[PDB]
Amino acid sequence: GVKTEQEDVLAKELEDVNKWGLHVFRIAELSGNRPLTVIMHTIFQERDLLKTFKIPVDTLITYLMTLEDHYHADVAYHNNIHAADVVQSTHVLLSTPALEAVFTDLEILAAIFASAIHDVDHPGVSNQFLINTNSELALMYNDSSVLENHHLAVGFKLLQEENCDIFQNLTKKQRQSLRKMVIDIVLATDMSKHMNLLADLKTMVETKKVTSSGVLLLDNYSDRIQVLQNMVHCADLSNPTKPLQLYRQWTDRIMEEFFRQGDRERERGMEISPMCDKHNASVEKSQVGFIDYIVHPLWETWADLVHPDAQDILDTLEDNREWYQSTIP
């Protein structure tokens, strides 16, 4: 009737679910490689989303396990642990004081569902690799946000498996709005969209308006979805902002995945993609470059939007950047 000793240690780790720096690798081990299922279940309960959207709990668990099973266990980075991490990171960003009572239950559901599906069935190679090899996926999506289109299509298609339709009790109006937001969020995870997303976030910080209660004013769809898009984008680019023990595990994983792509490119006589050549790699210099050109400008702009809620996240990012700089040989 009550939990095993393993289930109890897992539940104690899940008490950090509202904190930046959750031990997500430990949750992966303890859950029997079910980090996405257990973290999504915990967040759905915590935010009362089963009651709000009348999601049968058996349907939720069946869908979450099905979704987790369509992440590839042999992919070192773009797997269920990364999905779980982005979900939990989105969950913390949604709870930021500057956004209190800003977003509806449906918008919260969209951002979390989007986070959960955002990399499903990732083959561990880039859009460019799928385009250059003339893959079926690239043919299907006309070389345009190939992986991100595929993630969405799989995330939604899995709702049609036996007892998997977690949206069965939503009205058509709820479903159409949820779907448009989830699509808008996942398509924005394509790094080709980063510069336009960041420009729009900066424009929003420059024209920023606050309510009498001190929270952000977002009074049109365009502004609301832009913030959710940048939020899930920040969660996706949050590794360098985590405590260094977590950041370094993510770096080991992305470099294993990139080097594997580089090995496949070299064996096929293809040009080796940036940072994918294990014989010509500067892990440390690449991380400092990633932080300086991509991650820090994004998180600095996010920190301005929700000032001062993200100051400790930005501090961890700057400390991690200095640590990698100090190890450049």
Contact 115, 78 (CB under 8 A): no
d(CA 238, CA 295): 8
- Which residue carries 């991490």 as its tokens? 85
Question: Residue 319: which residues within 8 A CB-CB, separation 6 or more?
Answer: 244
Q: Least distance in Å: CB of 118 to Mg ion? A: 6
Stretch that binds Zn ion, among 59-67, 119-127, 142-150, 252-260 (CB under 5 A): 119-127
Q: 78 or 296: whose CB is closer to Zn ion?
A: 78
d(CA 184, CA 35): 25
- Which residue carries 């293809």 as its tokens? 270
Query: Contact between 257 and Zn ion (CB under 5 A)?
Result: no
Contacts with Zn ion by CB under 5 A: the residue count is 2
122 is an annotated ligand-binding site residue: no
DSSP output for 73-142: TT-SSTTHHHHHHHHHHHHHHHT-GGGTTTS-HHHHHHHHHHHHHTTTT--SS-HHHHHHTT-HHHHHTT
Q: 151 or 177: whose CB is closer to Zn ion?
A: 151
Query: Contact between 85 and Zn ion (CB under 5 A)?
Result: no
User: Which residue numbers are catalytic?
Assistant: 78
Q: 98 or 131: whose CB is closer to Mg ion?
A: 131
DSSP tag of 216: B
Contacts with Mg ion by CB under 5 A: the residue count is 2
Q: 62 or 82: whose CB is closer to Mg ion?
A: 82
239 is an annotated ligand-binding site residue: yes
In the list Zn ion, Mg ion, none, the entry touching 85 (Cβ below 5 to 8 angstroms by class) is: none
Query: Contact between 236 and Zn ion (CB under 5 A)?
Result: yes
Q: Least distance in Å: CB of 64 to Mg ion? A: 19
Query: Contact between 119 and Zn ion (CB under 5 A)?
Result: yes
Interacting residues with Zn ion between 170 and 229 (CB under 5 A): none
Q: Least distance in Å: CB of 85 to Mg ion? A: 12
236 is an annotated ligand-binding site residue: yes
Query: Contact between 68 and Zn ion (CB under 5 A)?
Result: no
Burial of 135 (0-12, 13-18, 19+ CB in 10 A): middle
Residue whose Cβ sits closest to Mg ion? 119
Stretch that binds Mg ion, among 65-73, 96-104, 167-175, 181-189 (CB under 5 A): 181-189
H helix runs in the chain, sequence order: 5-13, 24-30, 35-46, 49-53, 57-69, 80-94, 105-117, 127-132, 136-140, 146-157, 172-187, 194-206, 221-236, 244-267, 283-290, 296-305, 311-325
Q: 55 or 93: whose CB is closer to Zn ion?
A: 93
CA distances from 51 to 44, 47, 122 (A): 9, 9, 32
Interacting residues with Mg ion between 102 and 131 (CB under 5 A): 119
113 is an annotated ligand-binding site residue: no
Q: Least distance in Å: CB of 189 to Mg ion? A: 5
Q: Which candidate, 276, 236, 238, 282, places its Cα nearest to that of 257?
A: 276
Q: Least distance in Å: CB of 82 to Mg ion? A: 9
d(CA 157, CA 251): 31
Q: Least distance in Å: CB of 85 to Zn ion? A: 9
Annotated binding site: 78, 82, 118-119, 236, 239, 287, 290
Note the residues at the interface with Mg ion (CB under 5 A): 119, 189
Annotated binding site for 3',5'-cyclic AMP: 78, 287, 290
Annotated binding site for AMP: 78, 119, 236, 239, 287, 290
Note the residues at the interface with Zn ion (CB under 5 A): 119, 236
